[PDB]
Symmetry: D2
Subunit: 116 residues, 4 copies
Amino acid sequence: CPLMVKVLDAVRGSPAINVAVHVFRKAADDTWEPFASGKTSESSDSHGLTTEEEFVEGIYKVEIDTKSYWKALGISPFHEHAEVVFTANDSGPRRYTIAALLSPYSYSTTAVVTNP
Amino acid sequence: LMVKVLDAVRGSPAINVAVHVFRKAADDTWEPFASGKTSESSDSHGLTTEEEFVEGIYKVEIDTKSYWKALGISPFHEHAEVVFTANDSGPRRYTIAALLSPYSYSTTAVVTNP
Amino acid sequence: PLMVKVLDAVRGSPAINVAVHVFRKAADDTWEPFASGKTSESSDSHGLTTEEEFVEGIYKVEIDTKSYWKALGISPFHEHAEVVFTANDSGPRRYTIAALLSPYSYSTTAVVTN
Amino acid sequence: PLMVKVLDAVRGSPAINVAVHVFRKAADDTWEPFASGKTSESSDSHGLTTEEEFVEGIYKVEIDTKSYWKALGISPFHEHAEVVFTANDSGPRRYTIAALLSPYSYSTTAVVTNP
């Protein structure tokens, strides 16, 4: 797939399941146009959310509802959410894996961009 | 509110990194609050503003793109953000530690009791 | 059963032809080879996968990160990257060890399932 | 010349009283002890203060992360966290080793400055 979003819980060492993910595209005038939306689930290596649509050139935003993940576990976390804002600047076809590693007071975000 | 930024490509503090700050408006839009850029002097590896930080959802934007570009690297992210609620239980002491590579970053909050 | 992912944080790609050696602990400062090989990017499996199943115990994963960076004219801080951990304390599990490499930094994460 | 700083990414605080053991490689390729410390938080110095003078050679810093997490009732993934590195290879440097800890994850970074 052209986009893979993985969200990991670094305290449990597991995919963070039932996490809301919202992907957007920069529009003129600052507007963000919704591109994909979904919730994490698991089976095999696919412990994240995949879109089928490829990424033409632009600026994207991935929002991750990490506040609702922790609040479910009895934890009010530092971050109000995780956000990943990036350029898709190879105009030709690229694969994007975006991983978010979650703790109550920390997050980490990593991208892998490959050309198939 | 202290913001410390480390460069994982160079093994150094991230020198001359732009750090902006926002306070949440009623209009769901973000009202500015402060700016700053990380200054390496004596012992300080980060940008510390001189604020009287009240309660409310605050935003920290780090300009990682301009930082990596100026070093001839085409980074992944536009920037690295921390959105958090600052003083929901009296005064608190905040260090945001950010660690930066062209394709990844982590932000950690260190909350001490003043 | 064991997957090791090695990622280049500078380039945002799998770090390929990286040597990985896995060991089982045999006694004080004694390590038995468990499996080994090199990272290879075959699309979606970008890391090293081993057929061998874990029996209960302590395992060491050695990643030759220093060769990887030297082949790039970079003299990294770390001589290698090592992950030591206990396996199968509770039964038959799938382990994915990810290492994210930067010249002055490495970070390691583990996902353990079923 | 050698400083080791530890952050707890679960509790959002310095990791206080984590043990740090530093070894030096020997001409027979073994690990001879070098520096002994648990991490301390007095003032805003949130790490471990190693005093000894650094020569050219290979060093191993071991952070006992398992003891740390077991004391908060968490069974962590890792047995420990180590950094191995060649120090002082181009002359006297100052090392700050920064460790960030969660139970199934950790990172180490070096801040390397010229005195």
